[PDB]
Tab-separated table of N, CA, C and O in Angstrom:
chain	number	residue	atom	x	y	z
E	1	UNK	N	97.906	78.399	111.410
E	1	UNK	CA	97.596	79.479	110.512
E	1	UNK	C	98.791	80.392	110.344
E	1	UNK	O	99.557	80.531	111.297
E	2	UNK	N	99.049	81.144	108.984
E	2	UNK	CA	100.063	81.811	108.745
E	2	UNK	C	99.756	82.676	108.347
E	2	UNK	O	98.532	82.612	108.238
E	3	UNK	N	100.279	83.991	107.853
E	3	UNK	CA	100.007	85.439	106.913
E	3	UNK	C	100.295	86.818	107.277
E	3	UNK	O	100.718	86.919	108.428
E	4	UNK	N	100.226	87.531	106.855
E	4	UNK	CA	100.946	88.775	106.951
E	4	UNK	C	99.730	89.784	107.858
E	4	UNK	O	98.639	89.878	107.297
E	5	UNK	N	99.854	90.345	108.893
E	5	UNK	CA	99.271	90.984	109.461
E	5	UNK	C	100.166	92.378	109.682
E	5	UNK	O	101.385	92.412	109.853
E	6	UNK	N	99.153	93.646	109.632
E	6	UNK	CA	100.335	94.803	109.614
E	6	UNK	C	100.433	95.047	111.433
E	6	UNK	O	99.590	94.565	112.188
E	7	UNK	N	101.482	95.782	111.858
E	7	UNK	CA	101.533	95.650	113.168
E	7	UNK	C	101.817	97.513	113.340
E	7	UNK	O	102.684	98.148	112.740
E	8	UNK	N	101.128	97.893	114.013
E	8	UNK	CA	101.265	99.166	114.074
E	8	UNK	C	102.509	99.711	115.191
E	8	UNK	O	102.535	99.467	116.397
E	9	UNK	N	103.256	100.310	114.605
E	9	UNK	CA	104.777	100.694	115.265
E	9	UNK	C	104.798	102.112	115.690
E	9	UNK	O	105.678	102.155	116.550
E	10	UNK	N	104.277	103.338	115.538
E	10	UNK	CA	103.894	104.437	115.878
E	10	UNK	C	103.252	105.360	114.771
E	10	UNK	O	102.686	104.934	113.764
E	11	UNK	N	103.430	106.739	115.117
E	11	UNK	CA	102.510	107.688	114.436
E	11	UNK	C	103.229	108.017	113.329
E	11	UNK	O	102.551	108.583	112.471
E	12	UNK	N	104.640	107.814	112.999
E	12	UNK	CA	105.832	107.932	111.755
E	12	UNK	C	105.902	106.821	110.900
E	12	UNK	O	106.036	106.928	109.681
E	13	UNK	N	105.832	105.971	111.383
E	13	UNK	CA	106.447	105.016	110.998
E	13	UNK	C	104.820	103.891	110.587
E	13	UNK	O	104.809	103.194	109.573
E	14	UNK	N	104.097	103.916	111.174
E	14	UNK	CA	102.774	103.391	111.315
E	14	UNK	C	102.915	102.019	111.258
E	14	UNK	O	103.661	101.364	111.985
E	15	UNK	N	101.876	101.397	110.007
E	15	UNK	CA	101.709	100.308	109.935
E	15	UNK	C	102.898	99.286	109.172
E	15	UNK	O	103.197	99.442	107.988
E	16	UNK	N	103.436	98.368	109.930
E	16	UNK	CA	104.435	97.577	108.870
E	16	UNK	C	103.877	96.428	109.606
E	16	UNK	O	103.359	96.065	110.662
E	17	UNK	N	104.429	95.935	108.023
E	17	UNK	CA	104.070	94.682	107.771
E	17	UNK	C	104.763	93.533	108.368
E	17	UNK	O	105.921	93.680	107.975
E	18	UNK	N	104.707	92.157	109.307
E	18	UNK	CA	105.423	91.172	109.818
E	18	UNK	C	104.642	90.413	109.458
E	18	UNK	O	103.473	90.673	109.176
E	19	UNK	N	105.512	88.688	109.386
E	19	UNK	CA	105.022	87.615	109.021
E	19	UNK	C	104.202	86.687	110.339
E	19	UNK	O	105.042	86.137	111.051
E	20	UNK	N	103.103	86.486	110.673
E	20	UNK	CA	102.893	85.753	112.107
E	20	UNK	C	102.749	84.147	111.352
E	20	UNK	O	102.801	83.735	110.193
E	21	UNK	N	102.509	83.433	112.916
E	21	UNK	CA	102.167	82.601	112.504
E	21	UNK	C	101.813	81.740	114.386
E	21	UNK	O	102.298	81.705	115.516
E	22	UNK	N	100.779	81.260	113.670
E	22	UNK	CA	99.939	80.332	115.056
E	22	UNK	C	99.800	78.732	114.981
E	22	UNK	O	99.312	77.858	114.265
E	23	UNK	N	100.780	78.953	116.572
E	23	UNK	CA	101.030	77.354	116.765
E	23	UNK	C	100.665	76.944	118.345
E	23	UNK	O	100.632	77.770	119.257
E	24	UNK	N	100.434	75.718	118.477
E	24	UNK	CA	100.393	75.289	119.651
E	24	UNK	C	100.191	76.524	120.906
E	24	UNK	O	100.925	76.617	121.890
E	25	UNK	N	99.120	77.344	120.624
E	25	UNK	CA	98.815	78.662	121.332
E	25	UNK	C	99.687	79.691	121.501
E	25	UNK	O	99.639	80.562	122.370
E	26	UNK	N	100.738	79.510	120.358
E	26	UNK	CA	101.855	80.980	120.587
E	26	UNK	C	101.527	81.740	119.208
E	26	UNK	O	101.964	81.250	118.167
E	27	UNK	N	100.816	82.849	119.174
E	27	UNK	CA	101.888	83.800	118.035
E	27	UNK	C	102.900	84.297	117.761
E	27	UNK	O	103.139	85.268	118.479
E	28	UNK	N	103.649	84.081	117.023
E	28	UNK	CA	105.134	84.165	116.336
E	28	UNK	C	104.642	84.916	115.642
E	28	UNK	O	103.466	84.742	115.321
E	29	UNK	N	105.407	86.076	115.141
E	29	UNK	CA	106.002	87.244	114.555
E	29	UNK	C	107.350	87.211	113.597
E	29	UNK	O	108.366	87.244	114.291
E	30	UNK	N	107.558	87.167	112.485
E	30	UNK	CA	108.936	87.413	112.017
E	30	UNK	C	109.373	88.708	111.213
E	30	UNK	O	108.878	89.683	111.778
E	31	UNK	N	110.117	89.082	110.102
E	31	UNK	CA	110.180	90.000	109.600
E	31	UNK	C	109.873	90.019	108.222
E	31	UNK	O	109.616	90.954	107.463
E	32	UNK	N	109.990	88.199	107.967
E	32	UNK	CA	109.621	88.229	106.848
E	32	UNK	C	109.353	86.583	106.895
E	32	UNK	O	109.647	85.706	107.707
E	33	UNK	N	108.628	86.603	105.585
E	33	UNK	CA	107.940	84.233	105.973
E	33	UNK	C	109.062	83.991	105.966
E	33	UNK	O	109.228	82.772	106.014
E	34	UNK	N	110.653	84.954	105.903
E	34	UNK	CA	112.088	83.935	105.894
E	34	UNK	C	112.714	84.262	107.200
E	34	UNK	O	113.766	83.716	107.535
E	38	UNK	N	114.773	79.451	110.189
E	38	UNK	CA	115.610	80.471	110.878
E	38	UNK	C	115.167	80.705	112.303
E	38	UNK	O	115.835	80.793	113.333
E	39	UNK	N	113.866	80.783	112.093
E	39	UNK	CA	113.649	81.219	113.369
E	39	UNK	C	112.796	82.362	113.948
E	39	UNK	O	112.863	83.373	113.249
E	40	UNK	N	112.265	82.439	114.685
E	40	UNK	CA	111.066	83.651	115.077
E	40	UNK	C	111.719	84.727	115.631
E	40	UNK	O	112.660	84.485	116.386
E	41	UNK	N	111.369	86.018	115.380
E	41	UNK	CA	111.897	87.501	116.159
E	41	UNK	C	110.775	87.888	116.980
E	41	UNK	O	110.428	89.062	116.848
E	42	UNK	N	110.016	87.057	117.935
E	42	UNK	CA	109.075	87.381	118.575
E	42	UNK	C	107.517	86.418	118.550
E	42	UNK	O	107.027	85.852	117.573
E	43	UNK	N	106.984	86.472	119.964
E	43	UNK	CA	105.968	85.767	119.879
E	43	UNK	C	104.953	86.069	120.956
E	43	UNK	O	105.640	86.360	121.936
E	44	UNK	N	103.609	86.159	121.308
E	44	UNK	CA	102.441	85.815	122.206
E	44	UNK	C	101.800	84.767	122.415
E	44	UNK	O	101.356	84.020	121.543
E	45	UNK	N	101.672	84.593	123.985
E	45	UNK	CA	100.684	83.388	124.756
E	45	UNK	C	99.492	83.848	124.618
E	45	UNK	O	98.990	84.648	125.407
E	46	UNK	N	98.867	83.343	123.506
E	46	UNK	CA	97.537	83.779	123.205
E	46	UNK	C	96.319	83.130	124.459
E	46	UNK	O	95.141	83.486	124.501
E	47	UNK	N	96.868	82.277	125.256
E	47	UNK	CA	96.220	82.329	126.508
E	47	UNK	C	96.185	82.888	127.410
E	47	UNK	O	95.452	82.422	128.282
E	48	UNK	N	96.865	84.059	127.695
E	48	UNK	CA	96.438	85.114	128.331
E	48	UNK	C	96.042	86.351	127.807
E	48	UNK	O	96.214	87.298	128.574
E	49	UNK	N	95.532	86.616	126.650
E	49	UNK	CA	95.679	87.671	125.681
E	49	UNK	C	93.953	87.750	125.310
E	49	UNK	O	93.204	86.803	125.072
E	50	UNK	N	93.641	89.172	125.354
E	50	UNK	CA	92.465	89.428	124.978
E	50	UNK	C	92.312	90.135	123.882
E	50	UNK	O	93.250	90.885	123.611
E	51	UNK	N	91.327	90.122	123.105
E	51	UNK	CA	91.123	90.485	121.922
E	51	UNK	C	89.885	91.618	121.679
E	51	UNK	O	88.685	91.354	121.752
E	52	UNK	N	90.370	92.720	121.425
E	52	UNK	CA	89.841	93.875	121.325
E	52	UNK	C	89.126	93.821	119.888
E	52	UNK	O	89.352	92.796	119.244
E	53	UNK	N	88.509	94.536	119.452
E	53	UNK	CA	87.887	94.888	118.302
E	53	UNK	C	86.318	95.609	118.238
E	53	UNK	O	85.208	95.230	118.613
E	54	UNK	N	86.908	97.035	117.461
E	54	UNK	CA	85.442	98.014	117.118
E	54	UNK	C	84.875	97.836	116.115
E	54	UNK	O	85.496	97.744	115.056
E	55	UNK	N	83.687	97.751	116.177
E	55	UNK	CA	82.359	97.844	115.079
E	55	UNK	C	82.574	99.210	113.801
E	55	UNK	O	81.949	99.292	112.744
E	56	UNK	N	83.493	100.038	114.239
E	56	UNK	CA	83.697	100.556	112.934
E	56	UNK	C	84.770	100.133	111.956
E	56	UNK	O	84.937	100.496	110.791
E	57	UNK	N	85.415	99.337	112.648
E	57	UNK	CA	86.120	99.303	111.775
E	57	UNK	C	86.158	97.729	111.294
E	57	UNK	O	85.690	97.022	112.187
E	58	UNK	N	86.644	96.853	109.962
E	58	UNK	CA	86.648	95.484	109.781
E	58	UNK	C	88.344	94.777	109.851
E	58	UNK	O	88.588	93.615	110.175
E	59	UNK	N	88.923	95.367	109.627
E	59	UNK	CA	90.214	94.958	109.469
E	59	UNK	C	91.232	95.308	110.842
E	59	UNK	O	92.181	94.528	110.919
E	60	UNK	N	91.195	95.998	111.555
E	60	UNK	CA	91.780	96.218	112.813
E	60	UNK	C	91.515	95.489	114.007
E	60	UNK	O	90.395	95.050	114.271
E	61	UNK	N	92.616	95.332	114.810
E	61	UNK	CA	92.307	94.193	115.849
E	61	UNK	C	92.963	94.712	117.154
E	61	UNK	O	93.097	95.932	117.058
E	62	UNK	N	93.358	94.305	118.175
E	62	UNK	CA	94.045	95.239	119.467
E	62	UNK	C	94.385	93.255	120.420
E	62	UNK	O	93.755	92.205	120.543
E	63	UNK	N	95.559	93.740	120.778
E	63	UNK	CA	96.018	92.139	121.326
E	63	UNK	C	96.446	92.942	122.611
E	63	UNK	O	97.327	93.799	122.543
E	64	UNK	N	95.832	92.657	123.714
E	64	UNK	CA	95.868	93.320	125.112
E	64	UNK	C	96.373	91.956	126.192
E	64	UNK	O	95.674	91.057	126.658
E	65	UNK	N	97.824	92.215	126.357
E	65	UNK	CA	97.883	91.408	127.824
E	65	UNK	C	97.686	92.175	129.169
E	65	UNK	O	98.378	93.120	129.547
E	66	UNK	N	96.481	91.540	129.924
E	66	UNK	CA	96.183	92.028	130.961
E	66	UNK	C	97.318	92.615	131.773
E	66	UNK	O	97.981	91.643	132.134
E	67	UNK	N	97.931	93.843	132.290
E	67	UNK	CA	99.446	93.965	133.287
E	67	UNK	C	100.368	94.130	132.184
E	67	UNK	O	101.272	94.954	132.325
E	68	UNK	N	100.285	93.539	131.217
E	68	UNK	CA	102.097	93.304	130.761
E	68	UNK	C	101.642	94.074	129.217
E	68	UNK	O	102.696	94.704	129.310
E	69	UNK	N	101.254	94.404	128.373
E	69	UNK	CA	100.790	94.867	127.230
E	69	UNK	C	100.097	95.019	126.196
E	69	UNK	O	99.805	93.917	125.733
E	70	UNK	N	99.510	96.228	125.348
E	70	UNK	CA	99.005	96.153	124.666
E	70	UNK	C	99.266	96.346	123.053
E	70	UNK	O	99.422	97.528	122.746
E	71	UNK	N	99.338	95.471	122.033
E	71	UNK	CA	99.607	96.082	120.667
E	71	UNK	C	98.198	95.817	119.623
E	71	UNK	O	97.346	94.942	119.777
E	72	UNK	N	98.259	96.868	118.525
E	72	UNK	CA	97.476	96.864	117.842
E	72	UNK	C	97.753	96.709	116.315
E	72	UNK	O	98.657	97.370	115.803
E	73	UNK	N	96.983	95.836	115.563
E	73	UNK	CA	97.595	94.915	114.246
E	73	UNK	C	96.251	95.148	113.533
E	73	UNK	O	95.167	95.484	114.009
E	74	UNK	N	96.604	94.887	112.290
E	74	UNK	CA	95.506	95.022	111.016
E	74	UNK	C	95.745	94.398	109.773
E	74	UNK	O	96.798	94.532	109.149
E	75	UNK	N	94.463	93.491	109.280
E	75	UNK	CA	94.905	92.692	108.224
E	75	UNK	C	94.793	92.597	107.155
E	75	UNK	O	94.404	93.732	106.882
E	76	UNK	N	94.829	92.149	106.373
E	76	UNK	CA	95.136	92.489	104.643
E	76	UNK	C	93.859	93.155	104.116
E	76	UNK	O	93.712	94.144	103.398
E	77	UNK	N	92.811	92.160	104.795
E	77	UNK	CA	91.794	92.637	104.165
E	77	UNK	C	90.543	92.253	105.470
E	77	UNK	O	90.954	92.499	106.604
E	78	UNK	N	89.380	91.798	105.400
E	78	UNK	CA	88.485	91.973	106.515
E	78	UNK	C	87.914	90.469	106.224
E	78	UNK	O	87.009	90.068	106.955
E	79	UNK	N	88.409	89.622	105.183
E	79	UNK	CA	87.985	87.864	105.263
E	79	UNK	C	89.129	87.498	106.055
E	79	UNK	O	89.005	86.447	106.685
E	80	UNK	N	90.481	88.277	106.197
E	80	UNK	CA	91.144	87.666	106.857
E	80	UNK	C	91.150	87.832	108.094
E	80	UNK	O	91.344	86.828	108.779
E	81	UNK	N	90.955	89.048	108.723
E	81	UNK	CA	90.793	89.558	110.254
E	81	UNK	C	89.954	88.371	110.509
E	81	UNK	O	90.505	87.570	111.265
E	82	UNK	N	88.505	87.942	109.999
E	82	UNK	CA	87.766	86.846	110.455
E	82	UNK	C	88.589	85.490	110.589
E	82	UNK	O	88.207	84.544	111.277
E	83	UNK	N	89.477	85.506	110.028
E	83	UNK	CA	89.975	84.278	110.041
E	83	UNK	C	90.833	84.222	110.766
E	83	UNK	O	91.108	83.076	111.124
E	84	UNK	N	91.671	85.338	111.344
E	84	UNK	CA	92.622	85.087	112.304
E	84	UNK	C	91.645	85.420	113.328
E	84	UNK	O	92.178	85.175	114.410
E	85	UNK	N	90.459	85.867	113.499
E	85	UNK	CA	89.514	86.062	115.189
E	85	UNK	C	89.469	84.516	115.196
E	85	UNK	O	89.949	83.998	116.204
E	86	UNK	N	89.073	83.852	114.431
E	86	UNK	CA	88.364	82.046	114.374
E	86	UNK	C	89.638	81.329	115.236
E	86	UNK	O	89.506	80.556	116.186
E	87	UNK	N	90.668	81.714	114.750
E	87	UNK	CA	92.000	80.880	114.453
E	87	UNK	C	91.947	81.181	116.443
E	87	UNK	O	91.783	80.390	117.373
E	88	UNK	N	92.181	82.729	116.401
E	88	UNK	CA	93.037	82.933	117.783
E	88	UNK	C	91.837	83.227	119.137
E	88	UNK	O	92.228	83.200	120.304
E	89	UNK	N	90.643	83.450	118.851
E	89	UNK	CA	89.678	83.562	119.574
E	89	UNK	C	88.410	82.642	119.707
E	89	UNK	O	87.681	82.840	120.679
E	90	UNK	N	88.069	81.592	118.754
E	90	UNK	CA	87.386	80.836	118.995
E	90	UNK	C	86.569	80.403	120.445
E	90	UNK	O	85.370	80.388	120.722
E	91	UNK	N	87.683	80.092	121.159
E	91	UNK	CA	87.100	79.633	122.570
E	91	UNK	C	87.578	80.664	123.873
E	91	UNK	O	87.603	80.310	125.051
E	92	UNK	N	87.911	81.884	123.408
E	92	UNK	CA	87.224	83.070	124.094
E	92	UNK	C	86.144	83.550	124.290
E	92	UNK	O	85.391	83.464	123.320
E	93	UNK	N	85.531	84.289	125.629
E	93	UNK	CA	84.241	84.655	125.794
E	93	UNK	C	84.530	86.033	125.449
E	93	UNK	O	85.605	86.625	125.547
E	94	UNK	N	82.953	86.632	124.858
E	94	UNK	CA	83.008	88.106	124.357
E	94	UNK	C	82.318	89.101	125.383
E	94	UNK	O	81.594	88.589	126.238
E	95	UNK	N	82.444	90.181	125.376
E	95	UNK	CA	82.008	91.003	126.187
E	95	UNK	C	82.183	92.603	125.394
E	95	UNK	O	83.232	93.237	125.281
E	96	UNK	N	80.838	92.990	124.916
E	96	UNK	CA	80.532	94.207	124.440
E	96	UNK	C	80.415	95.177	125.467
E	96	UNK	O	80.026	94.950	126.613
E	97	UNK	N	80.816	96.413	124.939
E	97	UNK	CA	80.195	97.315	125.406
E	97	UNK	C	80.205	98.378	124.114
E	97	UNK	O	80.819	98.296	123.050
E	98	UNK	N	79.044	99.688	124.746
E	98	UNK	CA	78.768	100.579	123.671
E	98	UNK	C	78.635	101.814	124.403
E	98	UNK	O	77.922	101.973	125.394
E	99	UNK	N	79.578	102.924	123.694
E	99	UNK	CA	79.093	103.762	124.326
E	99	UNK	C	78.909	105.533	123.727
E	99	UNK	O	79.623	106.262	123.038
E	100	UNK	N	77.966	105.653	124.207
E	100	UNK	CA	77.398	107.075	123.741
E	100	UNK	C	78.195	108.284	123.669
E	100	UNK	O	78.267	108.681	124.832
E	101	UNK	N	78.811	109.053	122.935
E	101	UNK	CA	80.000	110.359	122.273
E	101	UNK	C	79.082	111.568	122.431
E	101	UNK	O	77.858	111.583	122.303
E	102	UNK	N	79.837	112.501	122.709
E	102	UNK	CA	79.113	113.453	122.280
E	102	UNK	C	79.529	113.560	120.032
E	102	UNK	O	80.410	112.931	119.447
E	103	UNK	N	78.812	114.260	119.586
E	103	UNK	CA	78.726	114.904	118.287
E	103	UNK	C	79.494	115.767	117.757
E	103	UNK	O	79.251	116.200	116.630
């Protein structure tokens, strides 16, 4: 699977855009679909975050070593990269009560 996912870089600068792409259990990252990769994740150790308010936002958490948070074009695609990169992950909800 390939496509543009935005990758959130801080509170200035926010969301930009990189090219990923999923292979043989790595995500690759580039700067643009144009050599060679500028980055990648072992999506086998990587857990996958995601809130009920929102459809398009996602959170890629390595247990110890890091967490980043990405968002996708639109919310048919977030489903399609959960299918792609989470399929045969187990889920585990929780919910919890705010104050107002």
């Amino acid at each position: 699977m390939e496509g543009v996912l935005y990758k959130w870089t801080n509170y200035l600068t926010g969301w930009q855009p990189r090219w990923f792409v999923l292979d043989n259990g790595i995500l690759s990252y580039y700067d643009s679909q144009d050599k060679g990769s500028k980055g990648s994740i072992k999506m086998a150790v990587c857990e996958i975050k995601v809130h009920s308010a929102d459809n398009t936002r996602m959170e890629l958490i390595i247990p110890g070593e890091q967490h980043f948070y990405m968002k996708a074009v639109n919310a048919a695609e977030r489903q399609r990269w959960l299918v792609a990169l989470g399929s045969s992950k187990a889920s585990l909800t929780d919910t919890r009560l705010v104050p107002r």
